[PDB]
Amino acid sequence: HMISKINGKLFADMIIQGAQNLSNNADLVDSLNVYPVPDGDTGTNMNLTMTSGREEVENNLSKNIGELGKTFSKGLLMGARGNSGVILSQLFRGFCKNIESESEINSKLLAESFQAGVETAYKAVMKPVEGTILTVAKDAAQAAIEKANNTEDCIELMEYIIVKANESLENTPNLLAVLKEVGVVDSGGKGLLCVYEGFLKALKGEKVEAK
């Protein structure tokens, strides 16, 4: 089985399964956070952000991926909350901007769209802290760009993205002393990986069940 092109219907499903997988793990993500500051529970905030995106998408489906991305982007903007939820919205509003003109995308454009999200979030900060959700997103996009050059199949691509995203996540305690000593990976990066894992599920035809 393989995926050569992703249209608005499949992207909508990726968004839905990614959001549900993140929602199932939101309490986990919150509990990994070393800095549960006021209104700063990472799992809660990323879940609110992603779910607002999900809800807009579910009420305005479209087979044109660019139009669906604009709907996703709108929901992300309204839902964005917290440091990690805002970064999540920059990553995916940048992603959606990169496909706004398209009706479907191939593996190369999928990878370029992840990269466009990373560049958005980096353009919006002056020297970001390594060891955070941004680091995981950066390494995931780098992987996507490397792999897309000789993989037409978006399933195989997304699996690779997840493997390397997970490597980056597990390495975040080596970038920040506080994570190594507490003994946890970065919570925002964990939440991001939950979204990616749901994307793969959608690409495989599979449903994330509600916890």
Residue numbers in the entry: 0 to 210
Text of the article:
Gram-positive bacteria utilize a Fatty Acid Kinase (FAK) complex to harvest fatty acids from the environment. The FAK complex consists of FakA, an ATP kinase, and FakB, an acyl carrier protein that brings the fatty acid substrate to FakA for phosphorylation. The N-terminal domain binds ATP and is where kinase activity occurs. Each of these structures formed a similar overall fold comprising a bundle of eight α-helices termed α1: G7-L31, α2: T41-N58, α3: I64-G78, α4: G81-I98, α5: S106-K122, α6: I132-N149, α7: C153-N173 and α9: S186-L202 and a short helix termed α8: A176-V181.
To provide mechanistic insight during the catalytic cycle of FakA, we solved the structure of a novel apo form (Apo-FakA_N) and ATP analog bound form (AMP-PNP-FakA_N) as well as the previously solved ADP bound form (ADP-FakA_N). To understand the changes that occur upon ligand binding to FakA, we solved the structure of Apo-FakA_N to 1.90 Å resolution and compared it to the ligand-bound AMP-PNP-FakA_N solved to 1.15 Å resolution. However, major differences were observed in the loops connecting α1/α2 and α5/α6. Upon ATP binding, the α5-6 loop moves toward the ligand binding pocket to stabilize the nucleotide. The α1/2 loop extends away from the ATP binding pocket in the apo form, then collapses to bring key residues in proximity to the γ-phosphate of ATP and to accommodate protein-protein binding during catalysis (discussed below). In Apo-FakA_N, the α1-2 loop protrudes away from the FakA ligand binding site; we predict this prevents premature binding of the other protein partner through steric hindrance. Hydrogen bonds between Asn44 and Asp38 with Arg80 stabilize this open form of FakA N-term, before ATP binding, then collapse and destabilize when in the ATP bound, closed form. Our interpretation is that the open state prevents protein-protein interactions when not bound by ATP. Before ATP binding, FakA_N exists in an open state with a potential steric gate to prevent aberrant protein interactions. However, upon ATP binding, the gate collapses and the face of Fak_N changes to accommodate its interacting partner.
